[PDB]
Design a binder for this molecule. Structure first.
Ligand SMILES: C[C@H](CCc1ccc(C(N)=O)cc1)NCC(=O)c1ccc(F)cc1
Ligand SMILES: C[C@H](CCc1ccc(C(N)=O)cc1)NCC(=O)c1ccc(F)cc1
Lengths: 726, 728
């Protein structure tokens, strides 16, 4: 009766999860990029109007992939010729459509191959980067103003990040920040002069006779890191007669003493900017609050106005120090920091007062500050029912920290335990996005009384689609190890009979601050493996795991490849001793960090896993990037942590692979975890005489996400797993 | 009751074929390495007489890879710190040991990382190439004269070949030729300045934090080729001038008009040198004969003395124009060329006479000319019993061409049908090397009457060890294709039973002038497949194959990837119909060119093959080198042969791979068939959604001959094949 969720279903995405992506343009309205045309919705009433026809740009001559409407509403930025680079970076061509005259600006147009572009926060100003230099257009048709002249491919980056700052710290390519009203344009400058280059071959189309060598400045663990500078430009004060004057904000001295990073930049007021710096030993970070000097034109960062944030048990922040959220007058701010008990909560600061006051506390953590009004502080956390894998939106009254209200917990407890949110400009409204455990639900609410205005998408189409199929169930629970409870989840085959013994696949990530046991609803590989193959797919959040306090997360500090891999093993043993698990058919697989862990596990000699698959894994921390690696491993030097660097490689575990069936996968164009990492595992396995399976994906990167590659890799892994299990 | 030849036996080399390596030092004497002490045997009787004892090189603190004794036997060159480069090239450490004073020369030592070293043919002169420049040492202990000053890594090569010339023309790294007197040192100079670079990653050992990018001047099809120059220096005048002057030998005019290659160099006499040159369009070739003008001190090459050699049906020579063998006075020579019937035979030439006279028969071919005396000419051919896969030594009367004597045919016809030979200084004696079908057999003979003097090695040892194990047999025969018979070979499992159906594996090479069906005895992977897994391992020589005349070898001219692929398929169809072959279990596998073919076969959609394995295959000719590729495909231009270059790729047949199990394998550091070729193959398979198996070998080259990689690759392919055949 009915059918199972198949591999073809997954790969051909026959069952689509409908989302509702809206972009707020005001505090009252938002744009909804429909399928054809872009409509505008009035948050309040519910009355809609078209913003621009789907046909508007037919004969444009080019295929547009994105639109960026200025905060003015007068102009529209048209982005095309999109060419992907790293995880966030890319180059493209842009055209400016005038919504007034309804024409396409044609003079002083934006350069092809533009690296980054951004409207100012209010008018119709423009800042963009081309050839690594920054340019500014006060008005769409006026000439661009060369702000910087030092740009130089792979050497100096102005307004954009280099590889490591893109991936590991800013999580963005952009490196410019407009002041609130658009007067000032702040930017960072990266210098990779002495940073070593990673080199790999890119084969490109068949037509290319000779392979090309891709070279990108990339600091591996302990190498020379790029250096950084920060600057501020007064866009209201630049002419066409003289070059723009960039005012540099330097230091702090405690930082200039050695290698450091610029980890955060947030504007406080029209004339106040906050900068957060991080030492290379990500133990210490300092936040500076600099003000603009009127009768001097410089920016002053008064000490006494700076805040120190450190950690004695590990690094600062989950992945980096948090972002402060300033109040109206920008004289105080809120930001998530670690408790005296190791739990991350919101702390209240006065820009000139050292000791902050925690406004939340408990044995749970605030995931993020979502919106700040003079009245309430809105945030998401996992406090609800003590489930670290859940997410709910809360609002705390700033006058009385005792008055905290959960805005999502009870909306529909059965179907929703994992929320995210999108607030309007002044947080007058907000879209709640429930992504599990039931089907994704998008609703719209008004902040005044926290009333539900209307459902935006309840995925009723999918619900009618799936009632047809034999869907797997999900169990989210925990086991107790040495005083602590550790969560895990299991994707269970339909008509799960605890009387039968099911093969089990351990799906791992397990990197620092990772979470794999959650209440999110998904349609993926594991769905198919459980539904069609009758395989139980489990995940476990052990030591090093995130969102449960520092005692847990910092357990692997300076000790990667130890407790997290052991807990993964220990957890499988427990599952294997549950009765419905076929102990002779347990497998393990991981992508990225999961690939590394999956590998360390297979080479651990545990005796638990028959087989395992590792996709684009790290094999030795000295091959991975500095910023990420060093944040947990310190420096690869004898004076520091060289011994563990050398003790935690997969290759040194090669002999132990003689006991398992291993599949090793990696894209040859992986700019993140270099093919080199898997190239060294394969060689160690060969030198020690271990047979195993292998698969390279030419020209694919860490995501192996091209459509065909994606279908190919999961089809291949599927065959491996069934062979190992039948 | 009884065992077999296992995978372990192959990988661990449990059963070893004994050899007998002689190194003639005179007309009646040779040296025989006893793994510990070299001895000098007297061909006449078989005397001992140690030359260098067991432990003469202890306290040397270095492992001597090889040795080379000066012609006058007064010095011995020692080679160590070996470091492989390409297929023939390598860098090494050298030291010279004075036998007269039993001392080691410590002064003026040869530099470490020397690219090549050679004693002069007489006496003890030395010439070596270091840092791409040529050096000469008149005496081992004296300072060396630098001959050239332009050597520049990856740019200018003096006395040594660039990548393409080493691989595809000279099958050697050396590019210097001593005159038979030792008076002149001739050498080539290659310029790679404008040649594109193949670039690929080398990961090295774990310790290397950042991968290395190896860059090598390597011209792919149609790309800019390296240029060449030829010079000659008189070493006996090095001690009278100051800066030695290398006399250049240019032209031939019909060559300089465009792209060309230095083809061959052979000294005729003490002051007569012969050079063969070839056009990039390899169907035209010219030999140039130059005499040393002792007056001008130059080399005058009479244009009237030039010899053209061309082909109307294909390229020239098997892989290149053949080598000339000059008579004692240099006024005449013997050279193998294909006759009007398309069969390669020997013809006699006079330096002053463009028309040559053929001295050997018809429907078979002379493999090579082995020796020349005033009396007879010795050569090897496959004329015996009309088996193109056999090899015998014959001698023909120079004064009467109808007097031809086979010297090895009947020595032991049942055990020996594949011979190679090694004559002494004046061909007064010669060693015969029987390679199959029976266990190798080495014997010494004397040329006066071709009388067998004695058996040098008969492998009686291996023989004993094998009578206890179930060894496979080898069927060598032919099938018929379009009125013409083509040979094949089959490695049959023990106690073969024609009634049972055996799975079959087609082992293919099938490149231009290839031969996979022969009378050679081998202990390889196929031995194990047959002896242990009971798999019939066959090889077929179809159109394009060699040693059977141009009609067959030139059939795929300008048409690579067509008939040769088809024939491989047609042969399997015939094998499947044979009755003792299991129709549903026929696999195919090949390495190199055979990888290309295997991949082309699997992508043909003939439905004949269940699975296949391609190791380091070519995927499209534009990716391969110019010299080898263009020789058979012409240039990749619309004016020439671009259309077939595009119609003969593996990728364009990706879709058909859906009906077969394919194992693609390749070394990441393959400087010959770049990893790129397989990288493009997998991408095309991924793009059409076909699943396959893959395996890359880190830092391994085209030979994947690393001890561990070798064991690992064969181990990997065994699992794949017996899995495809449902063994185990
Ligand atoms: C920007 C990202 C964010 C952190 C992150 C996210 C997801 C995984 C994850 N799913 O494993 C691992 C680590 N870091 C670099 C990265 O992608 C990475 C780190 C470590 C590694 F072994 C592979 C890749
Ligand atoms: C120096 C060699 C000598 C001729 C040769 C020998 C063996 C094979 C053979 N076993 O396939 C193919 C060709 N040619 C270049 C070469 O290595 C080559 C040619 C074509 C190809 F597809 C791969 C490699």
């Amino acid at each position: 009766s009915r059918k199972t969720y198949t591999l073809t279903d997954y790969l051909k995405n026959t069952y689509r999860l409908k989302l509702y992506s809206l972009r707020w343009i005001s505090d009252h309205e938002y744009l909804y990029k429909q399928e054809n045309n872009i409509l505008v919705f009035n948050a309040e009433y519910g009355n809609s109007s078209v913003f621009l026809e789907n046909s508007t740009f037919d004969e444009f001559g080019h295929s547009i992939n994105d639109y960026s409407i200025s905060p003015d509403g007068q102009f529209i930025l048209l982005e095309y010729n999109y060419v992907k680079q790293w995880r966030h970076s890319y180059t493209a061509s842009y055209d400016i459509y005038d919504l007034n005259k309804r024409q396409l600006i044609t003079e002083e147009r934006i350069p092809n191959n533009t690296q980054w572009v951004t409207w100012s926060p209010v008018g119709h100003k423009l800042a963009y980067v081309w050839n690594n230099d920054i340019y500014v257009k006060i008005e769409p048709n006026l000439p661009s103003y060369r702000i910087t002249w030092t740009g130089k491919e792979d050497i100096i980056y102005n307004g954009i990040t280099d590889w490591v700052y893109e991936e590991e710290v800013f999580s963005a390519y952009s490196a410019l920040w407009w002041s609130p009203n658009g007067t000032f344009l702040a930017y960072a400058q990266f210098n990779d002069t002495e940073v070593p280059l990673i080199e790999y071959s890119f084969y490109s189309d068949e037509s290319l006779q000779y392979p090309k060598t891709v070279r990108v400045p990339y600091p591996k663990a302990g190498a020379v890191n790029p250096t950084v500078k920060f600057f501020v430009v007064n866009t209201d004060s630049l002419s066409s007669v003289t070059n723009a004057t960039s005012i540099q904000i330097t230091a702090p001295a405690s930082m200039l003493i050695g290698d450091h990073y610029l980890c955060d930049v947030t504007w406080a007021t029209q004339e106040r900017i906050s900068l957060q710096w991080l030492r290379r030993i990500q133990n210490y970070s300092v936040m500076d609050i600099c003000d603009y000097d009127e009768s001097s034109g410089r920016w002053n960062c008064l000490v006494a106005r700076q805040h120190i944030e450190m950690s004695t048990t590990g690094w600062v922040g989950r992945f980096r120090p948090s972002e402060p959220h300033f109040t109206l007058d920008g004289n105080s701010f809120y930001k998530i920091i670690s408790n005296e008990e190791g739990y991350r909560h919101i702390c209240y600061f006065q820009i000139d007062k050292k000791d902050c006051t925690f406004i939340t506390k408990g044995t749970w953590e605030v995931i993020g500050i979502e919106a700040l009004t003079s009245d309430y502080l809105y945030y998401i956390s996992n406090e609800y029912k003590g489930m670290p894998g859940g997410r709910n939106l809360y609002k705390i009254q700033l006058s009385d920290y005792t008055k905290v209200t959960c805005l999502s917990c009870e909306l529909n407890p059965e179907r929703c335990q994992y929320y995210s949110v999108s607030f309007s400009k002044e947080a007058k409204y907000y879209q709640l996005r429930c992504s599990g455990p039931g089907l994704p639900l998008y609703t719209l609410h008004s902040s005044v009384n926290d009333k539900g205005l209307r459902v935006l998408e309840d995925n009723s189409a999918l619900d009618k689609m799936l009632q047809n199929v034999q869907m797997p169930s999900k169990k989210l629970d925990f086991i107790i190890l040495n005083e602590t409870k550790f969560w895990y989840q299991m994707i269970l085959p339909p008509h799960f009979d605890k009387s039968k013994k099911y093969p089990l696949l351990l799906d791992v990530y397990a990197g620092p601050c990772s979470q794999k046991a959650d209440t999110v609803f998904r349609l993926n590989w594991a769905t198919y493996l459980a539904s069609t193959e009758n395989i139980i797919v489990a995940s476990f959040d052990g030591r090093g795991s995130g969102y449960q306090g520092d005692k847990i997360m910092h357990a692997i500090n300076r000790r990667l490849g130890t407790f997290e891999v052991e807990d993964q093993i220990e957890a499988a043993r427990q599952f294997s001793k549950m009765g419905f698990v076929d102990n002779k058919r347990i497998a393990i697989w991981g992508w990225s960090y999961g690939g590394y862990v999956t590998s360390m596990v297979l080479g651990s000699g545990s005796g638990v896993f028959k087989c395992g698959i590792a996709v684009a894994p790290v094999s030795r921390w000295e091959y991975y990037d500095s910023v990420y690696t060093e944040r947990y491993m310190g420096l690869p030097t004898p004076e520091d942590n060289l011994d563990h660097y050398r003790n935690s490689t997969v290759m040194s575990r090669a002999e132990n692979f003689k006991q398992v069936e291993y599949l090793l996968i990696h894209g040859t164009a992986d700019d993140n975890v270099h093919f080199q990492q898997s190239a060294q595992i394969s060689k160690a396995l060969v030198d020690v005489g271990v047979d195993f399976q292998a698969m390279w994906y030419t020209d694919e990167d860490h995501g192996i996400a091209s459509s065909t590659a994606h279908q190919h890799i999961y089809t291949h892994m599927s065959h491996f797993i069934k062979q190992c299990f039948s």
